[PDB]
Amino acid sequence: PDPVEQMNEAEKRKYIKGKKLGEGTYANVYLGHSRDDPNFKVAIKKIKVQAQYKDGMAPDAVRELKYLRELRGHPNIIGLISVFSSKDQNLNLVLEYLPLGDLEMLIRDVERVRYGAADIKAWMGMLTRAVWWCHENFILHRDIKPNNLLIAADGEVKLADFGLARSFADPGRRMTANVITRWYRPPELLFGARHYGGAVDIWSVGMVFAELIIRSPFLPGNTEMEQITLICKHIGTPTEENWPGVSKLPEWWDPMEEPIPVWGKDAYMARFGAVGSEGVDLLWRTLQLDPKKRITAREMLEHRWWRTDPKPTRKEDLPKKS
């Protein structure tokens, strides 16, 4: 009988729920379509407001609701079409329908999916624009990885999971060091840094870039000490020389082995040479140990790799899942 309650029901009537595309304790995904245009399809994520959490609404729900609306409008960010409350006091997100899956399953499908350097350049262009748009709006994603990169019907890749996102903190405002999946976590976060910036996301992009080239995770450490050791082995040992004050981080740790000098651009050519010199130039700038000398998302978009041949593949010609 409440005026807001009937307004929510009027909004729920705008979209007709269909097949259950996904099940889960946190959320359930259903196929849907507008009542005024049944050809306009939509995905309805039914967030179970009660998901074994004793502190009320879960942070991943609050963050998605806030930042997906804030970032709405960009072609490489999953569009939040509408939000309405369910009869059972559950939260529902009407989202862009992205039927072609994500980038992880393409990368994992080594037997059937074939893609080349021009396709990597097309995907990376989409991802870089997404992270650029996030930072342009002072938002950190803090969980970039292949399986969080969903693919639209036309081939455009969209950044999706914002459950760990946060607005740019002010100076002196401490942030959590426990963000970003381990394999994509930058060294400053592995060291417990509490005052970081966009560079933390650029590092994850560098790992997605590297993972695309070799079609396997670059540094798949099983523990934080393994992740630290792996970065030391494959990128270089962070030291006070290349990263002043690094040893002063709240959780700085070193395997206490013979330090490995930081590898230069040439060293990456052997393994990641598929994208060429200019491509490995970009990769190397995204994987700088000191986040201060790490390339930014805006700088990334003006790099020469994009305008160097071969030109990126058109999204309509990108590989589809089998």
Added chain:
Amino acid sequence: DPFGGMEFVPSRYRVREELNHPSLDKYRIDQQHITGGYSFLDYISRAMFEAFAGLAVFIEDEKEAG
């Protein structure tokens, strides 16, 4: 166009290198802020945008005109 036609270029203001506030000075020399990669340029850019964002947005006149 690398920014997909979405590049934000402010109209009434410009974020130049000379902008600074003494309250920032305390943190610029904080070991954790520098060695951790905190961007003070982003904060200054964030403040300047919000200081001018919607300066000529007349809520009353715009909403009554619809």
Added chain:
Amino acid sequence: IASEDARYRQSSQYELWSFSPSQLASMREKTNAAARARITERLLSPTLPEFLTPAEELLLVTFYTAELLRAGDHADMSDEIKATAATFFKRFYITNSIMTYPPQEMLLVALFFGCKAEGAFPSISDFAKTFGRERPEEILAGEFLLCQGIRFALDVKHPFRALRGAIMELSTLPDVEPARLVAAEQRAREILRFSPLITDAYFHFTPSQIMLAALSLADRGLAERLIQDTFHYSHVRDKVLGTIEACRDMLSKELPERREHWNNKTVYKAQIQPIRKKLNKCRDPDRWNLVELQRIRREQASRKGFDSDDEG
């Protein structure tokens, strides 16, 4: 057609929670009138009580918005949290009437949800501790209710950071004095911390507009200087100045000195207490108890027609 203005108009704050004063009154009056009709219909199932007047409804919102801020101050919460919690409170009670849901409880909910909206996710048990609340479930019962009330718009824009940005632009002028700048910023911050949160400033003006207004009250010379400079390097300048002056007058009616007015024991007993008693006899009987409202709505979703406790 400024590019920073276009990006602002895409925010939820503008499309959803920005109206004209005439639109704001009509919504509040219709929300009160609809609530009056809804409670009246329920009561018959025969002397009806005296329902709160829209002005008396708005008066309690202002009183409890000040109490909300005081509660935030004692808990040493950040300015951005306070402003967001207060805004959620004001937004909740423009779509909903005070006679429907208890403002004494929604006050705590707006602070708890304001933390989350600003990246602070505390434990409900610890949150209840700081406010001497024995049972934390009393606060959670309104969390989702508040989320619907504010129409799922969690991105609220404040003028605090805009103020520090405006000071730097002034610091570039050589004629301006630093000691004068510090005093202006100090005062303008206290104004922003109270004046636009207790009044309808957010609904009719932009954070830049509100920010310049608080600075104009602290040092009119600096505010006029900043506006003149940017437009120097038209008709729009005069329309902006007129808009800031309209905001300057709205803020002046509830300056930081009024903090003691809304905490005065005599003002409470004389102006507020009568209203709370009128509200105590015309309130919604089913929705006032949030814990019970939540209980029946969870059991209604689980058990559709199955029941073994109904006696008629």
